Design a protein around this ligand. Sequence first.
Ligand SMILES: [Mn+2]
Length: 269
Amino acid sequence: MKLSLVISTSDAAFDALAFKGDLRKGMELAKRVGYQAVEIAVRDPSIVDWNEVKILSEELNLPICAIGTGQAYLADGLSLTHPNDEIRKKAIERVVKHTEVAGMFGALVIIGLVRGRREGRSYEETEELFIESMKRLLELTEHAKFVIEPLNRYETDFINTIDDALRILRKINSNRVGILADTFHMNIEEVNIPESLKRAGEKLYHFHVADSNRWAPGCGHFDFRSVFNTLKEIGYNRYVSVECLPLPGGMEEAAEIAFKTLKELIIKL
Ligand SMILES: [Mn+2]
Protein backbone atom coordinates (compact mmCIF):
# COMPACT_ATOMS: atom_id res chain seq x y z
CA MET A 1 0.00 0.00 0.00
CA LYS A 2 1.02 3.60 -0.71
CA LEU A 3 0.02 6.85 1.00
CA SER A 4 -1.40 9.89 -0.81
CA LEU A 5 -2.69 13.29 0.33
CA VAL A 6 -5.73 15.08 -1.11
CA ILE A 7 -4.91 18.77 -1.52
CA SER A 8 -7.55 21.48 -1.70
CA THR A 9 -7.08 23.97 -4.55
CA SER A 10 -8.85 27.20 -5.34
CA ASP A 11 -10.75 27.14 -8.61
CA ALA A 12 -8.49 28.51 -11.35
CA ALA A 13 -11.20 30.58 -13.04
CA PHE A 14 -11.96 32.28 -9.72
CA ASP A 15 -8.20 32.88 -9.06
CA ALA A 16 -5.45 31.47 -11.28
CA LEU A 17 -2.56 32.40 -9.05
CA ALA A 18 -4.36 30.91 -6.07
CA PHE A 19 -4.81 27.57 -7.83
CA LYS A 20 -1.09 27.44 -8.64
CA GLY A 21 -0.12 28.56 -5.14
CA ASP A 22 -2.45 26.14 -3.36
CA LEU A 23 -1.21 23.29 -5.54
CA ARG A 24 2.47 24.00 -4.91
CA LYS A 25 1.92 24.56 -1.18
CA GLY A 26 0.05 21.29 -0.88
CA MET A 27 2.47 19.24 -2.98
CA GLU A 28 5.45 20.59 -1.03
CA LEU A 29 3.60 19.71 2.20
CA ALA A 30 2.85 16.20 0.95
CA LYS A 31 6.48 15.64 0.00
CA ARG A 32 7.85 16.99 3.31
CA VAL A 33 5.52 14.79 5.35
CA GLY A 34 6.41 11.68 3.31
CA TYR A 35 3.39 11.02 1.10
CA GLN A 36 4.15 9.12 -2.11
CA ALA A 37 1.52 10.83 -4.29
CA VAL A 38 -1.07 13.60 -4.21
CA GLU A 39 -4.71 13.68 -5.17
CA ILE A 40 -6.50 16.74 -6.54
CA ALA A 41 -10.02 17.89 -7.30
CA VAL A 42 -10.88 20.31 -10.11
CA ARG A 43 -14.22 21.62 -11.36
CA ASP A 44 -13.31 22.27 -14.99
CA PRO A 45 -9.85 21.22 -16.23
CA SER A 46 -10.18 23.40 -19.37
CA ILE A 47 -8.96 26.48 -17.46
CA VAL A 48 -5.80 24.96 -15.91
CA ASP A 49 -2.36 24.81 -17.53
CA TRP A 50 -1.61 21.11 -17.01
CA ASN A 51 1.84 21.28 -18.61
CA GLU A 52 2.83 23.40 -15.61
CA VAL A 53 1.21 20.91 -13.22
CA LYS A 54 3.18 18.07 -14.83
CA ILE A 55 6.45 19.99 -14.40
CA LEU A 56 5.67 20.50 -10.71
CA SER A 57 4.91 16.79 -10.27
CA GLU A 58 8.23 15.93 -11.95
CA GLU A 59 10.18 18.47 -9.88
CA LEU A 60 8.85 17.09 -6.59
CA ASN A 61 8.75 13.40 -7.62
CA LEU A 62 5.07 13.31 -6.64
CA PRO A 63 2.62 11.58 -8.98
CA ILE A 64 -1.02 12.61 -9.12
CA CYS A 65 -2.88 9.40 -8.34
CA ALA A 66 -6.52 10.54 -8.62
CA ILE A 67 -8.64 13.49 -9.80
CA GLY A 68 -11.95 14.38 -8.18
CA THR A 69 -14.85 15.80 -10.20
CA GLY A 70 -17.52 16.66 -7.64
CA GLN A 71 -17.31 20.43 -8.11
CA ALA A 72 -18.71 19.93 -11.62
CA TYR A 73 -21.93 19.03 -9.82
CA LEU A 74 -21.80 21.32 -6.79
CA ALA A 75 -20.78 24.45 -8.72
CA ASP A 76 -21.90 23.81 -12.31
CA GLY A 77 -24.95 21.57 -11.80
CA LEU A 78 -23.63 18.86 -14.13
CA SER A 79 -24.92 15.36 -13.40
CA LEU A 80 -24.47 12.08 -15.26
CA THR A 81 -28.09 11.24 -14.36
CA HIS A 82 -29.64 14.68 -14.84
CA PRO A 83 -33.28 14.47 -16.00
CA ASN A 84 -32.39 16.99 -18.74
CA ASP A 85 -30.52 14.98 -21.39
CA GLU A 86 -28.72 18.16 -22.50
CA ILE A 87 -27.17 18.45 -19.04
CA ARG A 88 -26.36 14.73 -19.01
CA LYS A 89 -24.46 15.21 -22.27
CA LYS A 90 -22.61 18.22 -20.88
CA ALA A 91 -21.70 16.21 -17.78
CA ILE A 92 -20.27 13.42 -19.93
CA GLU A 93 -18.32 16.02 -21.91
CA ARG A 94 -16.94 17.58 -18.72
CA VAL A 95 -15.83 14.20 -17.36
CA VAL A 96 -14.14 13.44 -20.68
CA LYS A 97 -12.03 16.55 -20.05
CA HIS A 98 -11.11 15.16 -16.62
CA THR A 99 -10.00 11.93 -18.32
CA GLU A 100 -7.78 13.89 -20.71
CA VAL A 101 -5.94 15.35 -17.72
CA ALA A 102 -5.92 12.00 -15.92
CA GLY A 103 -4.16 10.41 -18.90
CA MET A 104 -1.26 12.83 -18.52
CA PHE A 105 -0.69 11.54 -14.98
CA GLY A 106 -1.95 7.96 -14.99
CA ALA A 107 -4.58 9.13 -12.48
CA LEU A 108 -7.92 7.61 -11.57
CA VAL A 109 -11.03 9.69 -12.28
CA ILE A 110 -13.41 9.76 -9.32
CA ILE A 111 -17.15 9.48 -9.92
CA GLY A 112 -18.60 11.07 -6.78
CA LEU A 113 -21.38 13.68 -6.70
CA VAL A 114 -21.05 14.17 -10.48
CA ARG A 115 -23.27 11.10 -10.80
CA GLY A 116 -26.21 13.15 -9.45
CA ARG A 117 -29.16 12.31 -7.19
CA ARG A 118 -32.51 10.58 -7.61
CA GLU A 119 -34.37 13.93 -7.81
CA GLY A 120 -37.72 12.33 -7.01
CA ARG A 121 -37.26 9.38 -9.38
CA SER A 122 -37.02 5.65 -8.78
CA TYR A 123 -33.65 4.23 -7.80
CA GLU A 124 -34.04 1.93 -10.83
CA GLU A 125 -34.31 4.77 -13.34
CA THR A 126 -31.47 6.73 -11.76
CA GLU A 127 -29.28 3.61 -11.85
CA GLU A 128 -30.15 2.89 -15.48
CA LEU A 129 -29.32 6.43 -16.54
CA PHE A 130 -26.03 6.22 -14.64
CA ILE A 131 -25.05 2.91 -16.23
CA GLU A 132 -25.78 4.38 -19.67
CA SER A 133 -23.59 7.42 -18.91
CA MET A 134 -20.75 5.23 -17.64
CA LYS A 135 -20.96 3.01 -20.71
CA ARG A 136 -20.78 6.14 -22.89
CA LEU A 137 -17.73 7.30 -20.92
CA LEU A 138 -16.08 3.92 -21.54
CA GLU A 139 -16.88 4.14 -25.25
CA LEU A 140 -15.40 7.66 -25.33
CA THR A 141 -12.11 6.78 -23.59
CA GLU A 142 -9.42 4.24 -24.39
CA HIS A 143 -7.31 4.41 -21.22
CA ALA A 144 -9.29 6.19 -18.49
CA LYS A 145 -10.06 4.33 -15.28
CA PHE A 146 -12.95 5.43 -13.08
CA VAL A 147 -13.78 4.80 -9.43
CA ILE A 148 -17.29 5.10 -8.00
CA GLU A 149 -17.33 6.52 -4.47
CA PRO A 150 -20.35 5.61 -2.30
CA LEU A 151 -21.38 8.67 -0.29
CA ASN A 152 -23.51 9.10 2.81
CA ARG A 153 -27.27 9.83 2.79
CA TYR A 154 -26.86 13.55 3.43
CA GLU A 155 -24.81 14.01 0.25
CA THR A 156 -26.86 11.78 -2.04
CA ASP A 157 -29.63 9.20 -2.27
CA PHE A 158 -27.89 7.38 -5.14
CA ILE A 159 -25.10 4.88 -4.31
CA ASN A 160 -24.71 5.01 -0.53
CA THR A 161 -22.97 1.65 0.08
CA ILE A 162 -20.23 -0.52 -1.35
CA ASP A 163 -22.97 -3.03 -2.26
CA ASP A 164 -24.83 -0.37 -4.27
CA ALA A 165 -21.63 0.21 -6.22
CA LEU A 166 -20.81 -3.50 -6.67
CA ARG A 167 -24.24 -4.09 -8.20
CA ILE A 168 -23.59 -1.30 -10.69
CA LEU A 169 -20.11 -2.62 -11.53
CA ARG A 170 -21.59 -5.99 -12.41
CA LYS A 171 -23.95 -4.29 -14.88
CA ILE A 172 -21.25 -2.08 -16.41
CA ASN A 173 -18.99 -5.13 -16.73
CA SER A 174 -15.69 -3.27 -17.28
CA ASN A 175 -12.43 -3.60 -15.37
CA ARG A 176 -11.92 0.12 -16.08
CA VAL A 177 -14.52 0.94 -13.40
CA GLY A 178 -13.92 0.12 -9.75
CA ILE A 179 -14.78 1.32 -6.23
CA LEU A 180 -13.43 4.13 -4.06
CA ALA A 181 -14.33 3.39 -0.42
CA ASP A 182 -14.19 6.27 2.07
CA THR A 183 -13.98 5.58 5.81
CA PHE A 184 -15.90 8.73 6.80
CA HIS A 185 -18.83 7.79 4.55
CA MET A 186 -18.63 4.09 5.46
CA ASN A 187 -18.76 4.97 9.16
CA ILE A 188 -22.34 6.09 8.52
CA GLU A 189 -23.55 3.78 5.75
CA GLU A 190 -21.85 0.38 6.15
CA VAL A 191 -23.06 -2.21 8.66
CA ASN A 192 -19.73 -4.07 9.02
CA ILE A 193 -16.86 -2.31 7.27
CA PRO A 194 -14.44 -5.29 7.14
CA GLU A 195 -17.19 -7.43 5.58
CA SER A 196 -18.03 -4.68 3.09
CA LEU A 197 -14.39 -4.44 2.00
CA LYS A 198 -14.15 -8.22 1.63
CA ARG A 199 -17.16 -8.14 -0.70
CA ALA A 200 -15.43 -5.40 -2.70
CA GLY A 201 -12.24 -7.45 -2.97
CA GLU A 202 -10.41 -6.87 -6.24
CA LYS A 203 -12.91 -4.15 -7.18
CA LEU A 204 -11.49 -1.80 -4.51
CA TYR A 205 -9.29 0.46 -6.64
CA HIS A 206 -8.78 3.49 -4.37
CA PHE A 207 -9.29 4.32 -0.72
CA HIS A 208 -10.06 7.58 1.12
CA VAL A 209 -9.31 7.92 4.83
CA ALA A 210 -10.56 10.41 7.41
CA ASP A 211 -11.74 9.82 10.94
CA SER A 212 -15.36 9.60 12.14
CA ASN A 213 -15.51 13.42 12.44
CA ARG A 214 -13.65 13.74 9.10
CA TRP A 215 -10.58 15.00 10.97
CA ALA A 216 -7.13 13.51 10.46
CA PRO A 217 -7.11 9.73 11.03
CA GLY A 218 -6.37 9.27 14.72
CA CYS A 219 -8.47 12.23 15.89
CA GLY A 220 -11.91 10.57 16.08
CA HIS A 221 -13.08 7.08 17.05
CA PHE A 222 -13.04 5.17 13.77
CA ASP A 223 -11.55 1.64 13.98
CA PHE A 224 -8.79 1.84 11.38
CA ARG A 225 -7.03 -1.22 12.80
CA SER A 226 -9.74 -3.63 11.65
CA VAL A 227 -9.86 -1.87 8.27
CA PHE A 228 -6.14 -2.25 7.69
CA ASN A 229 -6.22 -5.91 8.73
CA THR A 230 -8.86 -6.41 6.04
CA LEU A 231 -6.93 -4.44 3.41
CA LYS A 232 -4.01 -6.81 3.98
CA GLU A 233 -6.33 -9.84 3.83
CA ILE A 234 -7.72 -8.77 0.44
CA GLY A 235 -4.26 -7.93 -0.92
CA TYR A 236 -5.00 -4.22 -1.40
CA ASN A 237 -1.81 -2.66 -2.72
CA ARG A 238 -2.90 0.68 -4.20
CA TYR A 239 -3.32 4.12 -2.64
CA VAL A 240 -4.62 5.08 0.78
CA SER A 241 -5.42 8.76 0.28
CA VAL A 242 -6.00 11.20 3.13
CA GLU A 243 -9.13 13.27 2.47
CA CYS A 244 -9.79 15.09 5.71
CA LEU A 245 -10.76 18.46 7.08
CA PRO A 246 -7.71 20.58 8.01
CA LEU A 247 -8.22 19.62 11.66
CA PRO A 248 -6.88 19.55 14.21
CA GLY A 249 -4.60 22.54 13.86
CA GLY A 250 -4.73 23.32 10.14
CA MET A 251 -3.85 21.64 6.88
CA GLU A 252 -0.19 20.93 7.69
CA GLU A 253 -0.81 19.53 11.17
CA ALA A 254 -3.70 17.38 9.93
CA ALA A 255 -1.58 15.96 7.09
CA GLU A 256 1.22 15.11 9.53
CA ILE A 257 -1.08 13.50 12.11
CA ALA A 258 -2.83 11.50 9.37
CA PHE A 259 0.48 10.26 7.96
CA LYS A 260 1.74 9.13 11.38
CA THR A 261 -1.48 7.27 12.19
CA LEU A 262 -1.55 5.49 8.83
CA LYS A 263 2.16 4.67 8.72
CA GLU A 264 1.93 2.89 12.08
CA LEU A 265 -1.10 0.89 10.93
CA ILE A 266 0.61 -0.10 7.67
CA ILE A 267 4.06 -0.93 9.03
CA LYS A 268 2.55 -3.30 11.61
CA LEU A 269 0.85 -5.44 8.91
MN1 LIG B 1 -13.95 10.62 -0.16
